[PDB]
């Protein structure tokens, strides 16, 4: 998949759902998302 080869911003962190699927954890908003903020940003 169109992942994002690079360090996450000052709040996000990569993780996985055990099964193997990798998700993103936002420490600023306190949420999640399989998407990478690096992909969709401004």
């Amino acid at each position: 998949g169109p992942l994002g080869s690079g360090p996450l911003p000052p709040g996000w962190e990569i993780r996985n759902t055990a099964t193997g699927r990798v998700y993103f954890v936002d420490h600023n908003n306190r949420t999640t998302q399989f998407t990478d903020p690096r992909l969709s940003a401004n």
């Binding site: 306190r30 399989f34 998407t35």
Partner: peptide, 20 residues
């Protein structure tokens, strides 16, 4: 009506650690 959408729901909860 080919309503097809993947992901955008499965991502576990925030919390902090990696927990499905």
């Amino acid at each position: 009506g080919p309503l097809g959408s993947e992901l955008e729901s499965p991502p576990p909860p925030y919390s902090r650690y990696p927990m499905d």
